[PDB]
Design a protein around this nucleic acid. Sequence first.
RNA 1: GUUAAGUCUGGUUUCCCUCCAGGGUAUCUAAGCUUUGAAAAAAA
Length: 284
Amino acid sequence: AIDFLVNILELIKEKQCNINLFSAISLTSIVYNNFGEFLSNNQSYSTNNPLLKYHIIILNDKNKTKDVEEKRNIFKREVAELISRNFKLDGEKVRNYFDSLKEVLKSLKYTIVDVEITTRTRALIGVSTSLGKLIFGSGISFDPYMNLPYIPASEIKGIVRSYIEGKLGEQEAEEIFGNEEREGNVNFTDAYPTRSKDFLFVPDVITPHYNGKKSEADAEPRPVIHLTIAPKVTFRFLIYYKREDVGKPICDSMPIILIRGLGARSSVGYSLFELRKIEVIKAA
RNA sequence: GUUAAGUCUGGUUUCCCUCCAGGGUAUCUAAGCUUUGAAAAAAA
């Protein structure tokens, strides 16, 4: 119902790790995309909904539609700040998940290699995925049932494989990861954030001026507020296999490829990671 | 010199599947019944 929508911001502020962030952002996107309408005596006349203060601020009393536009921009920034502040990491379910999965893989007689990597700068993984896409035009790869951002197993595998190509040749890359005729020997799980020092998300901006622009006459900043993954967030994922003589390349490839980027726009130093730990458990 | 006032801009483009596999193998008829019963030599 509509009261769900008028209260979604309060619910974000008061649950902070226990609401579905995916659906929460999807719902508050309706508020963001009907902002001018949710501010015509249709705030349910509450007292905690952040929609109140946008009746108290007078940004432009001359023209009301401009006023609603500026209020909407302020509200976009405020939604970004809200999500970054309130939605924090509780990575105990993640440690439980990875420990149980490790036991499962041990029972299946796999050699497990559990890798912990910490982000060093603000990371962008899944920038074209849907999360905040309907508010920010930019997304984060988000698992809506772990209720966490994550790094897909396919990206980790692809980055490791492109490095192993660039180093040991396409033939060894196919001897490890397979081709259209043989299946790979190395399995990757998704990477989930297990611990953090502070905020899990933070706001950021990109402001292209001269992107696909003829001349300075075409120049104009178009700022893009969006969410990123805060620094010092540790992610964890597993690497399991059976054939022993495939652990050597993996071992070598992990420390290097994380220094270079792992998500989006690493060319300007965004998605850089440190190797926090690597443990190897040989099936005995 | 003093004051007073901020104003403009708030996501765009591309990629939407590609390759291989498009049936393989076995069975391809089997067992019966293979003629039987009436009429063989007729009146002028």
